[PDB]
Design a protein around this nucleic acid. Sequence first.
DNA 1: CATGAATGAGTATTCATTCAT
DNA 2: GATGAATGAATACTCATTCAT
Lengths: 190, 190, 190, 190
Amino acid sequence: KGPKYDQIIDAAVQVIAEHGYHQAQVSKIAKAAGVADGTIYLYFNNKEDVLISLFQEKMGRFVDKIRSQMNEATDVEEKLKILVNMHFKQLAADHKLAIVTQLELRQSNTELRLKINEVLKGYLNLLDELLMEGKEKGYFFQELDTRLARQMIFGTLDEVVTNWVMKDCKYDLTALVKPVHQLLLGGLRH
Amino acid sequence: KKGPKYDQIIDAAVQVIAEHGYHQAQVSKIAKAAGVADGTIYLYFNNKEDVLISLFQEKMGRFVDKIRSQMNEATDVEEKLKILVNMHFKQLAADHKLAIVTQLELRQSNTELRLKINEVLKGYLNLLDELLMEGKEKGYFFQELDTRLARQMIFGTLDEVVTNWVMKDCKYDLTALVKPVHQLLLGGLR
Amino acid sequence: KKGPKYDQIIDAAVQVIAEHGYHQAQVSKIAKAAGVADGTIYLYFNNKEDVLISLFQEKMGRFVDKIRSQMNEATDVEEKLKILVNMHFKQLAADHKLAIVTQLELRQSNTELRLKINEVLKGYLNLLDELLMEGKEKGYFFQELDTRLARQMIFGTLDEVVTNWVMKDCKYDLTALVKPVHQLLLGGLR
Amino acid sequence: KGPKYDQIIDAAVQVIAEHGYHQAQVSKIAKAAGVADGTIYLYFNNKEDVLISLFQEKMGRFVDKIRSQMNEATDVEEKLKILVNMHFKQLAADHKLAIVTQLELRQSNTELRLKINEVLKGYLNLLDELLMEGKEKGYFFQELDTRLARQMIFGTLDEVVTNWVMKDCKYDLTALVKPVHQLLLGGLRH
DNA sequence: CATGAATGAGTATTCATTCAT
DNA sequence: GATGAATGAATACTCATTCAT
């Protein structure tokens, strides 16, 4: 909405990344944004609204940037390949946000996460939309359950990423694109 | 011995956390559920957290063993993998309250509970590593395959499928998804 | 600046501890006595103990400085001792609530409050050492006198007299006991 | 009374001297007495009675041992001499009790300490007896306020002793007897 | 638009005491 | 008389949210 809306959201990322979720009270977020406590409530109406809006904004930029890149290739093998690239690229490009989103937000309470889960519905559409365009043009098993095939895909990508942050980003995440991508299409078999 | 009140308390804790949440499971509430006084809890446990540790150890400390128990009743590696999915899903489908506790409510930890959960988790992860290396060494799986990467695919997929089934309050039959998930892990999307 | 609420708290705490005791002066009770919310207390203080310490410091941290400044207005060393007794008794007789809190209530502390009291107490012991050394260096007190033992006799005599006065509910003139006490510390029983 | 009555009181001294006052729960005292927690209530009314009785029993002996020793004397300042001597000798001969009395009981709530000095009036009366006897036979000056001179003597002896335990009995308490005594009779002057 | 001082609900844990056996 | 398992009352501190300037 306003110009402080972005100072706050970006502060919340940098407050949570450095201090951790349970050490990110409103006042610590405020001081990092150069803003008073009650001013937070002029731009958001909850601590929860701050956290969800953080996710919505960052997720919107995330899915939009991916769908943009897939719009070029017309062929569903590369569309998956591009997805895996872009997913890993964006997270490798911002370690701080990765920490907040893969680690500290996991330490949330339960209905903040159910809300975060609703924000993920957008990405899961892009996945499910890909999985049905791969069935009609017959790139995938033509009796594929898309609900499950989506969950295998996100589950894998999210696990591989989460383990990358717990190792403190020691290794080149994007170097794993080809092996992960090849795994999703082919499976474990020889 | 431990006496009936020990079991009473762990049972009470499981279902309280399951109806109310991790952050709404005050000790008095658990004690009322167990039919004992607040201070009686501390005659069987050190902390509230020791209740939460014992809970996870009793209810999930044989989880991996049980999977291992049935995998050993099969020769073919690809069937072992299927049994692994089947026993992973069967055990969680068999206790809805526990499924809610361990997949949702109790992942919000960062304390010693987080330590103890990772002990059990690690055990599950080596069984995956062993199954993968066996399927590897014996030509079931392609050999340029990376174990730690394939391990993250399998667990990422299963845990995702499970957590989704829990968020939709255990409606659909999780055990019916064993066969579809299995052939996805083996033969990929293509 | 500390702001008006600072010593509203410090004062109200004296009143509560003097009327209920060290063991029944809860934060909420002090808070209401000060006319502020419980949390507001922690805006001007760190702990309950920081309150007790700040209480003792303000109310008793100039106790020795004050005695000292009246002793300076005398040249006779025996007259300085009479002034010391007079000023010791004067200050406590002038604040019955602070006397109850200091002689009976804050004694039973075991923590850092005790460290800060021993600081204030030690300075007083120094003043007694200092005086006693002047006395025997100039022939007022007998040459073979032990300072630490004499410091112990004086303090113990004053402390006992003050304490019994506080326990008989402060209802007899304390300062009227200066002359006989002073005469006893000088001439003994004979 | 009973046989366990004495085991309990002695265990109370042992626990309090070893763990301090704030770590002397009834269970610890029962365990040192070789009895059950509930057995203590077959001999005392409560934990406060255990403490009061402990003082009564130790005080009663302490006063009699002094009283009978003075009965074997003629001169009154010779009686004051054995008082200071026997007072210091009984405390010097039982260190762990002297920690309980001079240290740890001072850390108790006030309205138990006010029960402690009702016990003490027996001893104080003994002093009042000595002081008035000394007045008649002309041993002391005779507008001596016995009520006040009582508070000097006890106040001194107690402070001298309390400092001895504050320093782990690093020095011989009994070598102080006549330096202390001389002070009581002769005061500070040459 | 912005401030930041005030608010006040919420909770794990200890321990003296009881009573069924 | 002895037991000891069970009881339950009692209390400091945090932090998201407001509202008076």
